[PDB]
RNA sequence: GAAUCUGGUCAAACUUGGUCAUUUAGAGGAACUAAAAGUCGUAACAAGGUUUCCGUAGGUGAACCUGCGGAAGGAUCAUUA
């Protein structure tokens, strides 16, 4: 499990090993985009940032906790 | 009357530390300019769509905004109508 995907952009599937508000704090400044933590009931926790920066989202997910980079399959869309 | 030699004096330089100045590398940290077809907001110029700006304090992705006290560079020189 623990699958993660990015859909035009929301990130569905996020490990809980670090606090969410600091993730938002680093995200907004390193992307320069509006950031939302939307907690829909019992779906993959929603973190939404504007623009088409999936390469930059890759950079962020590498720089936050990511060390696998193999279960990430971003849908183009 | 030479070498030698006791004392001193001027005293170069050496040995060792201390001192600062001038250059010099130095991981990395931190900017600042030009670069104008990246990025996300649209802060400011009109009542900039919440009036602007200053000092001060806080929080915040940013341009900010909020509090307190100021000013007109205000959008009023004016209610003894
Ligand atoms: Mg002598
Ligand atoms: Mg530079
Ligand atoms: Mg944009
Ligand atoms: Mg505006
Ligand atoms: Mg304004
Ligand atoms: Mg308004
Ligand atoms: Mg002036």
């Amino acid at each position: 499990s623990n699958y993660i995907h990015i859909r035009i952009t929301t990130v569905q599937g996020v490990p809980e090993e670090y606090d969410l508000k600091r993730i938002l704090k680093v995200l907004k400044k390193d992307f320069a985009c509006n950031g939302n933590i939307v907690k829909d009931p019992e779906m993959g926790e929603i973190i939404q940032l504007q623009g088409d920066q999936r390469a930059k989202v890759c950079e962020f997910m590498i720089s936050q906790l990511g060390l696998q980079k193999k279960n990430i399959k971003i849908h183009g869309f």
Side-chain angles (χ1 to χ4, degrees):
Chain A
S1 48
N2 203 359
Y3 276 91
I4 171 162
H5 295 282
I6 301 160
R7 209 165 157 101
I8 296 158
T9 78
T10 51
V11 175
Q12 291 178 21
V14 167
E16 286 166 305
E17 288 160 302
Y18 266 89
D19 44 359
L20 311 158
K21 186 172 286 294
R22 312 293 153 74
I23 287 171
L24 186 151
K25 181 187 276 284
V26 62
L27 270 173
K28 285 176 165 177
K29 269 205 157 79
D30 285 335
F31 290 173
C33 291
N34 164 56
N36 288 133
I37 295 160
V38 163
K39 282 193 189 160
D40 192 276
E42 288 90 5
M43 271 176 248
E45 306 309 321
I46 296 174
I47 295 171
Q48 192 168 234
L49 293 150
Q50 290 172 327
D52 285 330
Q53 293 186 179
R54 286 145 290 151
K56 268 159 192 211
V57 186
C58 283
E59 270 185 44
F60 156 82
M61 71 205 198
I62 288 152
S63 179
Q64 162 55 66
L65 196 67
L67 61 84
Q68 325 91 34
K69 283 285 278 175
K70 283 173 187 168
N71 298 52
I72 295 90
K73 268 174 269 155
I74 306 155
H75 192 257
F77 201 80

